[PDB]
UniProtKB/Swiss-Prot annotation, chain C:
Record Pfam families: Proteasome, Proteasome_A_N
Known function: Component of the 20S core proteasome complex involved in the proteolytic degradation of most intracellular proteins. This complex plays numerous essential roles within the cell by associating with different regulatory particles. Associated with two 19S regulatory particles, forms the 26S proteasome and thus participates in the ATP-dependent degradation of ubiquitinated proteins.
Source organism of the structure: Homo sapiens
Protein name (Swiss-Prot/TrEMBL): Proteasome subunit alpha type-2
Quaternary structure and interacting proteins, as annotated: The 26S proteasome consists of a 20S proteasome core and two 19S regulatory subunits. The 20S proteasome core is a barrel-shaped complex made of 28 subunits that are arranged in four stacked rings. The two outer rings are each formed by seven alpha subunits, and the two inner rings are formed by seven beta subunits. The proteolytic activity is exerted by three beta-subunits PSMB5, PSMB6 and PSMB7.
GO terms of biological process kind: proteasome-mediated ubiquitin-dependent protein catabolic process; response to virus
CDD domains linked to this entry: proteasome_alpha_type_2 (cd03750)
Inducers of expression: Down-regulated by antioxidants BO-653 and probucol. Down-regulated in response to enterovirus 71 (EV71) infection (at protein level).
PTM summary: Phosphorylated on tyrosine residues; which may be important for nuclear import.
Lineage, broadest ranks: Eukaryota, Metazoa, Chordata, Craniata, Vertebrata
Subcellular location per the Swiss-Prot or TrEMBL entry: Cytoplasm; Nucleus
Swiss-Prot record, chain D:
One GO term (biological process): immune system process
Record protein name field: Proteasome subunit alpha type-1
Domain of life the protein comes from: Eukaryota
Subcellular location per the Swiss-Prot or TrEMBL entry: Cytoplasm; Nucleus
Gene responsible for this protein: PSMA1
Chief localization: cytoplasm
Glycosylation sites per record: 107
GO cellular component: centrosome; cytoplasm; cytosol; extracellular exosome; nucleoplasm; nucleus; proteasome complex; proteasome core complex
Protein family: Belongs to the peptidase T1A family.
Cited Pfam families: Proteasome, Proteasome_A_N
Source organism of this protein record: Homo sapiens (Human)
From Swiss-Prot, chain G:
Organism: Homo sapiens
Gene (name only): PSMA7
Main localization, broad class: cytoplasm
GO cellular component: cytoplasm; cytosol; extracellular exosome; nucleoplasm; nucleus; proteasome complex; proteasome core complex; proteasome core complex, alpha-subunit complex
Record GO biological process: proteasome-mediated ubiquitin-dependent protein catabolic process
N6-acetyllysine modifications at: 226
Superkingdom classification of source: Eukaryota
Post-translational modification note: Phosphorylation by ABL1 or ABL2 leads to an inhibition of proteasomal activity and cell cycle transition blocks.
In-chain residues carrying the UniProt-annotated modification Phosphotyrosine: 152
Function statement: Component of the 20S core proteasome complex involved in the proteolytic degradation of most intracellular proteins. This complex plays numerous essential roles within the cell by associating with different regulatory particles. Associated with two 19S regulatory particles, forms the 26S proteasome and thus participates in the ATP-dependent degradation of ubiquitinated proteins.
Segment forming the signal sequence: none
Name under which the protein is recorded: Proteasome subunit alpha type-7
One GO MF term attached to the UniProt entry: identical protein binding
Curated annotation (Swiss-Prot), chain H:
Species classification: Eukaryota, Metazoa, Chordata, Craniata, Vertebrata
Protein species of origin: Homo sapiens (Human)
Modified sites of kind N6-acetyllysine: 126, 175
Gene that encodes the chain: PSMA4
Pfam families: Proteasome (PF00227), Proteasome_A_N (PF10584)
Main localization category: cytoplasm
Subunit record text: The 26S proteasome consists of a 20S proteasome core and two 19S regulatory subunits. The 20S proteasome core is a barrel-shaped complex made of 28 subunits that are arranged in four stacked rings. The two outer rings are each formed by seven alpha subunits, and the two inner rings are formed by seven beta subunits. The proteolytic activity is exerted by three beta-subunits PSMB5, PSMB6 and PSMB7.
Transmembrane segments: none
Name of the featured protein: Proteasome subunit alpha type-4
PANTHER family the record matches: PROTEASOME SUBUNIT ALPHA/BETA
Length: 240, 204, 232, 238, 240, 228, 239, 250, 99
């Protein structure tokens, strides 16, 4: 106490509690996982329905930054739509200045330097968000990135954001990555959301899957959800 | 032109241990005089004067801006100003107004504040400092003053013959000019004293 | 920023400025130095050590030139020194672009300290933690001045700053007479430099710069090692 | 309690308390209910009078020919977002010569109220909205919050004791599609009367109804034309 | 003692000290990582381990060896988010030296530009001083190789061999006895002493996959990151 | 004891805007009644010393031609709101050639009721009573430092805030006349004031649809007193 | 560039800085002023001269124009800013409207200046209170006053400074029309009112009159001797 | 953010100042200046606060700052805050001459500074000035004048004023011993040497501890005289002789 | 004043007062010619009078360790400078930012 008010002051051992407080605000949020196959990235976000409380398809946390770039935000939803506008605005200036599609290595670095800049001053607070960046290209393959509220951004094959962070990634690494098509990954994501988060605190919940890769021609779009409905039928087979 | 709007003639000649400066005494507007006592030589310390010629607005404007900057220089230091430091000071003030300039051409003629060494220089309207060893002139009737001082200058000149020389250089060159005249004042300064004389010229 | 600009240095109810008195405490816990004026040149002598044998002494310099004839050292802290050196480098050029003449040593210290006083009254910043010793031979007579974090300026003959300055102050009060030569001044600046130095005085433990009437001249470690024989 | 003062300061629990104090400002306002059908979006509000002689404070206010909002918070933050709301609708009317979609209007609102919840020296906009619109894909009912989280819903209610209104809407959400206008409106005002004590009710003086639809511009009714809507009702049993 | 707000903002203590900068000196140590810089007679070795705790995490997006220009490389310790903001300042002001001046920036002049920026962050009392370190190597014309180190206080000096990170007092005390016994230093003697100094302080005796070597040569002035195969060549050569 | 000037209460309200409404209670009382024949309006001057000349103290201020006012609270803070309300009726007439309605005057005043802050001060400390005759007949509106615009039929604000409003609802109906509303208001005033009732303590201003310029001076105020 | 509110509200519904600034007005020298029908009068007490030092620069009754006269209270530094501000306004009003400035227009300039100077941020309010005396056209002698809050009134007899309540209570028991009939009686009345403020030995009383046709004329110290003598003469005739 | 603000603006709850009062009580420590006039001429006595042997004194005007061709000043307070005001007030006097070609009178130069010192007390939260300085000079309207500046921004006309708290006893001497229109350039100097002999605690009044500057009006020049080395000493030998003569009555 | 009518203070001694106390303590001592007791009082910037003994103890003690009954002025000059141990911080920067 006394050192944990401003984001500019240091602790007497040398850390910043305003960043430490914002990270566990992201921890108190529902689970969103991501995993890439050999030719694409598959997103999966658990979505909570309290009783009715909204439509069927409101406030979806699977945003769409560029034609070939996705989001899997989790945490404080209001600041997530702020980062989604900053990443949207960043990718247009790369298009206007240079004339081709933004590489994901830049787009993680350009956003993380904006997240880092809100951890230096007493005027502003750090963002209470964390998110995923998934892309696919014919000259760079698929990449999957991950940004914390501090600003540390580097690569992964499979990551998880939410309450069930360490509990869900235990069985993500039980899967294989190179020898899987992303059509197989879609029904593999659907069981991980279904295994974790038992219907005790939250009875009803949704399951939104988004997917970019070689089958989607590099364009990012949502999976056909009402069409063919193979996610939840294969996921509920794990009853024992 | 703009330099010929009022007229003027400033001459400075270097002697042996003394320097002399001279100017005319006319204020007019292109054909019509107004007075006979328009000051064109302003003192800057002791044994160091400055002459100005050209547009009569920029004569009185630069002579007050330079006096503004000179008193601040002499109070932030203790000493008086050297003649080289004045020439660098004026050349800054004329170059700041690079695009819309002051239509004037200064002439500096003084002595050393330490020794008795004379100094003469003249500047352009945008501030190109030009030092000589014999004489500098400025004004509308410039070419007549070059015809005087080339045939009427000797290296080592006592203050008696220095006064008799710059007087004949001014009284013959200015009486050939149309927009200059109406009296000539001559300052002859040296280490001991300062002598100011007004000549007897054609009043037409 | 926001636009705060509120002064954090106010008057005590006793009637003193507290933060400037604390900035002088950081100066006294610095490296010792000694500057002696001796009627033909001024000698600046600092005490430069390394924490280990791993450093490189040909990298960071103490006795620093300003224009061509104006030297400058310090006794406060390290990183605040390089700011007001670069400030004084640029500030000596606007004198030369206007007056076309090298700046007198009395004229920099009026201007460096006026930067430094106004720096303390302004808000949101701390004062500097560096005292200076500015010297130079202009118009025949040499000069030797001292600034402070309050922004005041003085004119010494033989002073000392840094650690154990009161021991060097009584030593220079007895050793330094009214006038010497430059070579007598270097001999007595080293004879007061290791009042509180270590045992070894090599060419890398000290670093001495002089101001002749020919100009500022920083001594290379060859002549420092050649003069340190039979020193004091 | 030292971290319960500014908006910039986080908490050791991880929850900013100035947003949590702004949610309680919404509950101080009077209750209002917004719902929709296949072809219409009707929001019904409840007015409060200050004294017996003063007029009732108005709740529903017109924005555009197809967008109308309700209110549940302060009045300075009401008109400050209202003047921003009218301004954006006529800009796209001027530039693209088309009415705005309702969904991308509200995305500008959540981006608008984000800045005074992160920088120092600003308060959150303590205000609650029920945005009801109509565009090229059907009617919409949107609610907001001072935490800048907008919700696409089918039937909600915000204000004082609005929990009792939500329970009426959950057990009648299936009938809210095959209902034209008259049983669409009178389902809505039965939700308001369950946010009332059992001794007073709607008296054509503290209630307003706004309807927008396919062939209908957003029209506000108050105190004269509410009386055809207030008929064929039944008293609350006890 | 604490007087006024000396424990919070960058002002002086009554003892003539200040605390927020010397709190930032142990803001490096929370990374749990160590970097070693060794200069030879014709080379300059940068060796630094990395810790990869996750199997679902890349081995290419982690390495702190960063390329400033074609002839200047660096290594970053401290925390990760602050270190990458320090690199984009170093990449940028090395480019302005080319545009303004024409020739390539020396490695000594670049640490003056960095340490003056860290001065101001110390200096203004309303922002955070970016606790991280900075070690540069490079070949200078007619001067040989150089090693410099910047600090969050904002000072630099030249070096012969000095490590940073967590273990300084154990690593530099090993390097003192190594240098002052006047051994030879050609290429591989420099690399072998750069491995064993990290291998005796940490006492690991690793596998060639965690450390990275960033050597630069007089004959090859380009900054070069070593391959995993040739790191194994230098490691089994010193294993007799 | 110095918290943020713009901070929500833990219960949900405000801090300093709540204190602004408290600072109206020390001001002098004022009564205005809307009647279909016209709007009457009354105030008490509260003269402190006989050396003070009374007519330099005013509470009724005309706005453009047909709109009156009544301030209660801080005097010089009210002078800023008056000088803006005069101008904003003139910009309406020299851009539309019509008189700004009484409701839309109060909207323009109530915009900057809570536009204080650090960038882009403190909230004001006066409540007002705008009354006038426009195209929808006579009108009477009431505002506050919280910017809560409202319409009242007969509002009474100031020191006797609760005491007058209780006595006023006792004797009021819809079909009043103008002469009945004038004599009824000063009955309320003399019950709530502490001094006597003369031609120097109170003042009136009645705006009519025909007599648009509200006009009321001394030697007529004595006639209304002596007839009751 | 300064954004910090200084004057905020209190929990009971008051201010802080305004009541504090009126305390500094209470710690000042008293200065009264009455009016009449042709000639106005105002005088200051508590001169407190060192009696060996200069006194033309300690004069605290000045004129903004050829019609309007000043008399302030409180601290002297804040008065000099307000006076030299108000000299500009009464001179720029003469540029637009050709009349001399009325006494009503110049007090609304000062009072509205002093209010917005408390409304804004980061600004220490003034601590003065003026007595503005000037007879306008049509021969209208009147006097106003100011206040650090920014209010203005019209009085017939004002008192400020240290012990204004005693002087105002003295003038309260003196509501005569005969004292505003004779001119020198009104001047002696000011000398009578200022007598029970300070020790008042006829040397610490600086008064100045204006007969609505001429600029202000300070009475002589020999005039103050004859005025104190006739006051002591008629006071002893109560036996 | 806001808890670091020092609040150098708010009134005391007593109802007076809180920050300016600290400097006005501080100003009496470590400074002593005075100045006397009653006829043609005006002087300024100063006091070398620390005269150490390893010092240059090459400036020849240490505490006196000749700010114009007609005026000068004696400053006491913060050393470096004096240099801000003397650079400013020297420049105010020169922009007047640019505008009018007429020398600045002594009255409306002092008022130009006191408006600057006041404005850094009201708004901004700036640290106020801790500088109290004196004024001499000559105008075309009154002549030889003295003024006393304050950190609050208040001035006044004087004839025997002072600055230091040690010199508060000197005012008791100057009320006891002062003449009205009988000043010479000897009766005024010998009075000041008598003051600093008693008010300063330096025994025997060492001539390297005092400093005296006078302003006379010679023909049209207003010569500002700074007297240096031996005239101080023979003034002391004149003063010590008169003290040895007057003590013979004892 | 109903109880105590007289409140006599005791100021620090002056230069002649320091000189006269010094002559009392040096009267019982042994002195060498060519010595100035006035400068000893003049090197005491506002002394206390109690330390006039302390100078006369340290001067005779320095003459003791030479087994010498003679004393110079230099012995008194080291005796005064020893007792003058004040926490005055003579950096020429504490009494010198405040001229």
């Amino acid at each position: 106490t006394g050192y944990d008010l401003s984001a500019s002051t240091f602790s007497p051992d040398g850390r910043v509690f305003q960043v430490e407080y914002a990270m566990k605000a992201v921890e108190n949020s529902s689970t969103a996982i991501g995993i890439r196959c050999k030719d694409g990235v598959v997103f999966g976000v658990e979505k909570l329905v309290l009783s009715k409380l909204y439509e069927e398809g409101s406030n979806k946390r699977l945003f769409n930054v560029d034609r070939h770039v996705g989001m899997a935000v989790a945490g404080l939803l209001a600041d997530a739509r702020s980062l989604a506008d900053i990443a949207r605005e960043e990718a247009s200036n790369f298009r206007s200045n240079f004339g081709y599609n933004i590489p994901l290595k830049h787009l993680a670095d350009r956003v993380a330097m904006y997240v880092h800049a809100y951890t230096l001053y007493s005027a502003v607070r750090p963002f209470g968000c964390s998110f995923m960046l998934g892309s696919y290209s014919v000259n760079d393959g698929a990449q999957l990135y991950m940004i914390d509220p501090s600003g540390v951004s580097y690569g992964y094959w499979g990551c998880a954001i939410g309450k069930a962070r360490q509990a869900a990634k235990t069985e993500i690494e039980k899967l294989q990555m190179k020898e899987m098509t992303c059509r197989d990954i879609v029904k593999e994501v659907a069981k991980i959301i279904y295994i974790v988060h038992d219907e005790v605190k939250d009875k009803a919940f949704e399951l939104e899957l988004s997917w970019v890769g070689e089958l989607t021609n590099g364009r990012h779009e949502i999976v056909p959800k009402d069409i063919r409905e193979e996610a939840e039928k294969y996921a509920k087979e794990s009853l024992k | 032109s703009i330099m010929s709007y009022n007229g003027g003639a400033v001459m400075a000649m270097k002697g042996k241990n003394c320097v002399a400066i001279a100017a005319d005494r006319r204020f007019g507007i292109q054909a019509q005089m107004v007075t006979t006592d328009f000051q064109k030589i302003f003192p800057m310390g002791d044994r160091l004067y400055i002459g100005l010629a050209g547009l009569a607005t920029d004569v009185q404007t630069v002579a007050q801006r330079l006096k503004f900057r000179l008193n601040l220089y002499e109070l932030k230091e203790g000493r008086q100003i050297k003649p080289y430091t004045l020439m660098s000071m004026v050349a800054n003030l004329l170059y700041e107004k690079r695009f819309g300039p002051y239509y004037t051409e200064p002439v500096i003629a003084g002595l050393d504040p330490k020794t008795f060494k004379p100094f003469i220089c003249s500047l352009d309207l945008i501030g190109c400092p030009m030092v000589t060893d014999d004489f500098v002139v400025s004004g509308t009737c410039a070419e007549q003053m070059y015809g005087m001082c080339e045939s009427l200058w000797e290296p080592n000149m006592d203050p008696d013959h220095l006064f008799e020389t710059i007087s004949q250089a001014m009284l013959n060159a200015v009486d050939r000019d149309a927009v200059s005249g109406m009296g000539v004042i001559v300052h002859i300064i040296e280490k001991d004293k300062i002598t100011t004389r007004t000549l007897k010229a054609r009043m037409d | 920023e926001r636009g705060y600009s509120f002064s954090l240095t106010t008057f005590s109810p006793s009637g003193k400025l507290v933060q400037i008195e604390y900035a002088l405490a950081a100066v006294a816990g610095g490296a010792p130095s000694v500057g002696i004026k001796a009627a033909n040149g001024v000698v600046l002598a600092t005490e430069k050590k390394q924490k280990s044998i791993l450093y490189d002494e040909r990298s960071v310099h103490k006795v620093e030139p300003i224009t061509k004839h104006i030297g400058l050292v310090y006794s406060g802290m390290g990183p605040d020194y390089r700011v007001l050196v670069h400030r004084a480098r640029k500030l000596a050029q606007q004198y030369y672009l206007v007056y076309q003449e090298p700046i007198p040593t009395a004229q920099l210290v009026q201007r460096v300290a006026s930067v430094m006083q106004e720096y303390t009254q302004s808000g949101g910043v701390r004062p500097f933690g560096v005292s200076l010793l500015i010297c130079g031979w202009n118009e025949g007579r040499p000069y030797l001045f001292q600034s402070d974090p309050s922004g005041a300026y003085f004119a010494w003959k033989a002073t000392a700053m840094g650690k154990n300055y009161v021991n060097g102050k009584t030593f220079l009060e007895k050793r330094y007479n009214e006038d010497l030569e430059l070579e007598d001044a270097i001999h007595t600046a080293i004879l007061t430099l290791k009042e509180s130095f270590e045992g070894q005085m090599t060419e890398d433990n000290i670093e001495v710069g002089i101001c002749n009437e020919a100009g500022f001249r920083r001594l290379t470690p060859t002549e420092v090692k050649d003069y340190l024989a039979a020193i004091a | 309690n030292q971290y319960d003062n500014d908006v910039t300061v986080w908490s050791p629990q991880g929850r900013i308390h100035q947003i949590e104090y702004a949610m309680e400002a919404v509950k101080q306002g009077s209750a209002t209910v917004g719902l929709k059908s296949k072809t219409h979006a009707v929001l019904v509000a409840l007015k409060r009078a200050q004294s017996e002689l003063a007029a009732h404070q108005k709740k529903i206010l017109h924005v555009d020919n197809h967008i109308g909002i309700s209110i549940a918070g302060l009045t300075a933050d009401a008109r400050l977002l209202c003047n921003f709301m009218r301004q954006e609708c006529l800009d796209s009317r001027f530039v693209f010569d088309r009415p705005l979609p309702v969904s991308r209007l509200v995305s500008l609102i959540g981006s608008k109220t984000q800045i005074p919840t992160q920088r120092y020296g600003r308060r959150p906009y303590g205000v609650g909205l029920l945005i009801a619109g109509y565009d090229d894909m059907g009617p919409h009912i949107f609610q907001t919050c001072p935490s800048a989280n907008y919700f696409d819903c089918r039937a909600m209610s915000i204000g004082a004791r609005s929990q009792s209104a939500r329970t009426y809407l959950e057990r009648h959400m299936s009938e809210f599609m095959e209902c034209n206008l008259n049983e669409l409106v009178k389902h809505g005002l039965r939700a308001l009367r369950e946010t009332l004590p059992a001794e007073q009710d709607l008296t054509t003086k503290n209630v307003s109804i706004g309807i927008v639809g396919k062939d209908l511009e957003f029209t506000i009714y108050d105190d004269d034309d509410v009386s055809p809507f207030l008929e064929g009702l039944e008293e609350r049993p006890q | 003692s604490s007087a006024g707000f000396d424990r919070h903002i960058t002002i002086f203590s009554p003892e003539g000290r200040l605390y927020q900068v010397e709190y930032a000196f142990k803001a490096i140590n929370q990374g749990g990582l160590t970097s070693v810089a060794v200069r030879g007679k014709d080379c300059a070795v940068i060796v630094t381990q990395k810790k990869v705790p996750d199997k679902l995490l890349d081995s290419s997006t982690v390495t702190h060896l960063f390329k400033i220009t074609e002839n200047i490389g660096c290594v970053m310790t401290g925390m990760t988010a602050d270190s990458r903001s320090q690199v984009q300042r170093a990449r940028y002001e090395a480019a302005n030296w080319k545009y303004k001046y024409g020739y390539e920036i020396p490695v000594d002049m670049l640490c003056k530009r960095i340490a003056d920026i860290s001065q101001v962050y110390t200096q203004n009392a309303e922002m955070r001083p970016l606790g991280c370190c900075m070690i540069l190597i490079g070949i200078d014309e007619e001067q040989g190789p150089q090693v410099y180190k910047c600090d969050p206080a904002g000072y630099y000096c030249g070096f012969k061999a000095t490590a940073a990170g967590v273990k300084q007092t154990e690593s530099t005390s090993f390097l003192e006895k190594k240098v002052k016994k006047k051994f030879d230093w050609t290429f591989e003697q420099t690399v072998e002493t750069a491995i064993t100094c990290l291998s005796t302080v940490l006492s690991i005796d690793f596998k060639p996959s965690e450390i990275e070597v960033g050597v630069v040569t007089v004959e090859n002035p380009k900054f070069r990151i070593l391959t995993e195969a040739e790191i194994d060549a230098h490691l089994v050569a010193l294993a007799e | 004891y110095d918290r943020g000037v713009n901070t929500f209460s833990p219960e949900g309200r405000l801090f300093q805007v709540e204190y602004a409404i408290e600072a109206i209670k020390l001001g002098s009382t004022a009564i205005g009644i809307q009647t279909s024949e016209g709007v009457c309006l009354a105030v008490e001057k509260r003269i402190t010393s006989p050396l003070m000349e009374p007519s330099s103290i005013e509470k009724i201020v005309e706005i453009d031609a047909h709109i009156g006012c009544a301030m209660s609270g801080l005097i010089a803070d009210a002078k800023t709101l008056i000088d803006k309300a005069r101008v904003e009726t003139q910009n309406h007439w020299f851009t539309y050639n019509e008189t700004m309605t009484v409701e839309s005057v109060t909207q323009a005043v109530s915009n900057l009721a809570l536009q204080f802050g650090e960038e882009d001060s403190r909230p004001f400390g006066v409540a007002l009573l705008f009354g006038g005759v426009d195209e929808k007949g006579p009108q009477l509106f009431h505002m506050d430092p919280s910017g809560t615009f409202v319409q009242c039929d007969a509002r009474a604000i100031g020191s006797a805030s609760e005491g007058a409003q209780s006595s006023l609802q006792e004797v009021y109906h819809k079909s009043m006349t103008l002469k009945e509303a004038i004599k009824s208001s000063l009955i309320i005033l003399k019950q709530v004031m502490e001094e006597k009732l003369n031609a120097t303590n109170i003042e009136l201003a009645t705006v009519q649809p025909g007599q648009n310029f509200h006009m009321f001076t001394k030697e007529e105020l004595e006639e209304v007193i002596k007839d009751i | 560039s300064y954004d910090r509110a200084i004057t905020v509200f209190s929990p009971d519904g008051h201010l802080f800085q305004v009541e504090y600034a009126q305390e500094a007005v209470k710690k000042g020298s008293t200065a009264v002023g009455v009016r009449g029908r042709d000639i106005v009068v105002l005088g200051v007490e508590k001169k407190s001269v060192a009696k060996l030092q200069d006194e033309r620069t300690v004069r605290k009754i000045c004129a903004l124009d050829d019609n309007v006269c000043m008399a302030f209270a409180g601290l002297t530094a804040d008065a000099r800013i307000v006076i030299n501000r108000a000299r500009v306004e009464c001179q720029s009003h003469r540029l637009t409207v050709e009349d001399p400035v009325t006494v009503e227009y110049i007090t609304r300039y000062i009072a509205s200046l002093k209010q917005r100077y408390t409304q804004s941020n980061g600004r220490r309010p003034f601590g003065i209170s003026a007595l503005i005396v000037g007879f306008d056209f049509d021969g209208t002698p009147r006097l106003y006053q100011t206040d650090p809050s920014g209010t203005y009134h019209a009085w017939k007899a004002n008192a400020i400074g240290r012990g204004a309540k005693s002087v105002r209570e003295f003038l309260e028991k003196n509501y005569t029309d005969e004292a505003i009939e004779t001119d020198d009686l009104t001047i002696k009345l000011v000398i009578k009112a200022l007598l029970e403020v300070v020790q008042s030995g006829g040397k610490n009383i600086e008064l100045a009159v204006m007969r609505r046709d001429q600029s202000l004329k300070i009475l002589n110290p020999e005039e103050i001797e004859k005025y104190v003598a006739e006051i002591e003469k008629e006071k002893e005739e109560n036996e | 953010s806001r808890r670091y603000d020092s609040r150098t603006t708010i009134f005391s709850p007593e109802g007076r100042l809180y920050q300016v009062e600290y400097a006005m009580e501080a100003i009496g420590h470590a400074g002593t200046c005075l100045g006397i006039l009653a006829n043609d001429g005006v002087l300024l006595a100063a006091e070398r606060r620390n005269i150490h042997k390893l010092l240059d004194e090459v400036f020849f005007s240490e505490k006196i700052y000749k700010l114009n061709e007609d005026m000068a000043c004696s400053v006491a307070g913060i050393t470096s805050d004096a240099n801000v005001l003397t650079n400013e007030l020297r420049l105010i006097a020169q922009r007047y001459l640019l505008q009018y070609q007429e020398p600045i009178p002594c009255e409306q130069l002092v008022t130009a500074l006191c408006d600057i010192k006041q404005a850094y007390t009201q708004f901004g939260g700036k640290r106020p000035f801790g500088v109290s300085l004196l004024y001499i000079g000559w105008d075309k309207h009154y002549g030889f004048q003295l003024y006393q500046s304050d950190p609050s921004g208040n001035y006044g006309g004087w004839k025997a004023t002072c600055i230091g708290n040690n010199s508060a006893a000197a005012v008791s001497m100057l009320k006891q011993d002062y003449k009205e229109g009988e000043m010479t350039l000897k009766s005024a100097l010998a009075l000041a040497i008598k003051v600093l002999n008693k008010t300063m605690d330096v025994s025997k009044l060492s001539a390297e501890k005092v400093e005296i500057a006078t302003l006379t009006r010679e023909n049209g020049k207003t010569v500002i005289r700074v007297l240096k080395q031996k005239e101080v000493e023979q003034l002391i030998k004149k003063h010590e002789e008169e003290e040895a003569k007057a003590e013979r009555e004892k | 004043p109903g109880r105590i009518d007289r409140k006599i203070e005791f100021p620090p001694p002056n230069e002649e007062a320091r000189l006269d106390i010094l002559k009392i303590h040096s009267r019982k001592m042994n002195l060498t010619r060519g010595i100035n007791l006035r400068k000893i009082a003049e090197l005491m910037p506002g002394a206390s009078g109690a330390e006039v003994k302390g100078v006369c103890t340290e001067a005779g003690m320095y003459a003791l360790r030479e087994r010498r009954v003679h004393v110079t002025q230099e012995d008194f000059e080291m005796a005064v400078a020893k007792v003058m141990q004040k926490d005055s911080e003579k950096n020429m920067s504490i009494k010198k930012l405040w001229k």
